[PDB]
Amino acid sequence: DVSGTVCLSALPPEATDTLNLIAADGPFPYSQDGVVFQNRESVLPTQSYGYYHEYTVITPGARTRGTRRIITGEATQEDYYTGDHYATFSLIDQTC
Amino acid sequence: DVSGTVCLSALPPEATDTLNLIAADGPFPYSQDGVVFQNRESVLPTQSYGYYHEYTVITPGARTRGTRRIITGEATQEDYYTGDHYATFSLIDQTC
What we know:
The structure is a homodimer of 96-residue chains.
Chain A: E1 5-7, H1 13-24, E2 53-56, E3 69-72, E4 79-82, E5 90-93
């Protein structure tokens, strides 16, 4: 299940950066950015393979990719944030 | 519930160090390494007491033992990572 909706302004600033890179079609900092997210655990709504893709949200200071991601869905404005390594997701509202 | 599976290569490098010590049965850096994990919140599957053990994953820069751990179960390659002090867990895939 999706936890709720959160305004973009309420998320870390790095989430805005990732969304801007997605709009531009990259380039992306990490090699894993843009790979299919399989939704294996069925946390997000059931969709076809390739409906979802994953992108890093940089964690300041981290040596690794960390735990923060944006998952895009194919629908307009359908973007999910996770800060806990895919345990929970919130829909991003870019209007606020 | 477990949050998903994570590749070992995607975890902080110290996770590999901890897995190597577990394979050798130590010696371990902390006296709390190898204690039973009680799974009090039932995040992991329910098992008899003593099934799970916990080990520190060192966090460089932290002043404490930090929040990163590996929990082992008794089955082969049943190794879980938590980065958030036991709130969420991922199964480690050592093949990737």
